[PDB]
């Protein structure tokens, strides 16, 4: 590799310039036709919208400022926008516009019609190893990119991996993303995907993302996660147990990669070692993988979602559809001044 560190060097410059001086107020609410809710959440919803002058469809994420403040997610939200407007990568969902009004924060992202990986994974049951390795490869390249910018992602899961029309992954939800050099201590993520050091409140680094990758690869190939139960606590117990069992149909390579990733000891976890990401890229499981054709998206995807129109939502579950009011008074002005 030579044009890799060259790539990441130029990418750090592009990122840091946007990081230093983030864009703001690049649209407003009346420029969009609100059509349908693609996904719900704690802070508000994620609607499918059409840009009035462009005709393009986007996914507008709406955040109730008061709910953000109430859940003490102010800083996390400021992280998410600032990181999103600054990063740029083939497998990352792209932030077109950001703005705010008296009541809400808005993040307008390119629309990914293929739906969550979650939905296709659950319906199909499980992916064969070649299918799971096409996806895993995209995540490997994405974490390499992000970590080089000192960004930690902290919420990898099939629910946050969208599939585009060419069958590739777009990573979404940067709510827990954070630029950090060194350790951090926030308990956040999704139970089945929490690294042991997160649960044990030890303080952790970007190695929790590689653990999450192991969990992802396992779920994609097994059809279920390596640690599941009915209550998160019992999930944490299995995670900190350090004991994992693989399905009989798992290849010997796949098993070896996963024990390396689901390694409880940070001194023996893949991605957290001297050779960093290349320990993973040069694993036998990935011996078939052309990292360059993956990035360039020249491979052929093993699955391409049924397309049937620009504003189609057939790959998304239906949600109840709430009012959208804007208070006549400004809410939480000081807190979100930099958004």
């Amino acid at each position: 590799q030579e044009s890799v560190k060259e790539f990441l060097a130029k990418a750090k410059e592009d990122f840091l310039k946007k990081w230093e001086t983030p864009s703001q107020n690049t649209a407003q609410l009346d420029q969009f036709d609100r059509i349908k809710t693609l996904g719900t959440g704690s802070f508000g919803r994620v609607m499918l919208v059409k840009h009035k002058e462009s005709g393009n469809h986007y996914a507008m994420k709406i955040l109730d400022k008061q709910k953000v403040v109430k859940l003490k997610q102010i800083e996390h939200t400021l992280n998410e926008k600032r990181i999103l407007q600054a990063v740029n990568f083939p497998f990352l969902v792209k932030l077109e516009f950001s703005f705010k009004d008296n009541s809400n924060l808005y993040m307008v992202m390119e629309y990914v019609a293929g739906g969550e990986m979650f939905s296709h994974l659950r319906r199909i049951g499980r992916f064969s190893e070649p299918h799971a390795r096409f996806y895993a490869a995209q995540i490997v390249l994405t974490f390499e990119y992000l970590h080089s910018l000192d960004l930690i992602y902290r919420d990898l899961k099939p629910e946050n991996l969208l599939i585009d029309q060419q069958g590739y992954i777009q990573v979404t939800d940067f709510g827990f993303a954070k630029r950090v050099k060194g350790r951090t201590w926030t308990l956040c993520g999704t139970p089945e995907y929490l690294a042991p050091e997160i649960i044990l409140s030890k303080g952790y680094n970007k190695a929790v993302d590689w653990w999450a990758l192991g969990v992802l690869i396992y779920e994609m190939a097994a059809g279920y996660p390596p640690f599941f139960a009915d209550q998160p606590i019992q999930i944490y117990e299995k995670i900190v147990s350090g004991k994992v069992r693989f399905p009989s149909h798992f290849s010997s390579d796949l098993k070896d990669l996963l024990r390396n990733l689901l390694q409880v000891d940070l001194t023996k976890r893949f991605g957290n070692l001297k050779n960093g990401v290349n320990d993973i890229k040069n694993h036998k499981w990935f011996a078939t993988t052309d990292w360059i054709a993956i990035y360039q998206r020249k491979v052929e995807a093993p699955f391409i979602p049924k397309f049937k129109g620009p504003g189609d939502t057939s790959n998304f579950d239906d949600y109840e559809e709430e009012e959208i009011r804007v208070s006549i008074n400004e809410k939480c002005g000081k807190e979100f001044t930099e958004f």
């Binding site: 996390h76 629910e159 939800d173 139970p191 089945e192």
Partner: peptide, 20 residues
Amino acid sequence: TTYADFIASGRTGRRASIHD
């Protein structure tokens, strides 16, 4: 089977993020 035990569990749906 593990699959059967999973499909019968309460966390087969979309899983919420957590923070505290």
